[PDB]
Amino acid sequence: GIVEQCCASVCSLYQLENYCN
Amino acid sequence: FVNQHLCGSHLVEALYLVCGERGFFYTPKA
Ligand code: NI
């Protein structure tokens, strides 16, 4: 998941917006 | 914006900044 990608790899702030309500 | 390496509490901080008053779900794997 995202928690995982951002830590094991990298992620963008735009990918994080996918988790907003 | 740039890509980020975010683990643990740092990821939660980023979600907070990105989502602000919209809120967010923090949903780690099993
Ligand atoms: Ni730290």
From Swiss-Prot, chain A:
Gene it is expressed from: INS
Cystines in this chain: 6-11
Residue ranges of the TM segments: none
Entry protein name: Insulin A chain
Lineage: Eukaryota, Metazoa, Chordata, Craniata, Vertebrata
Highest taxon, organism lineage: Eukaryota
Swiss-Prot record, chain B:
Protein name, UniProt field: Insulin B chain
Gene designation: INS
Residues of the full protein shown: 25 to 54 of 105
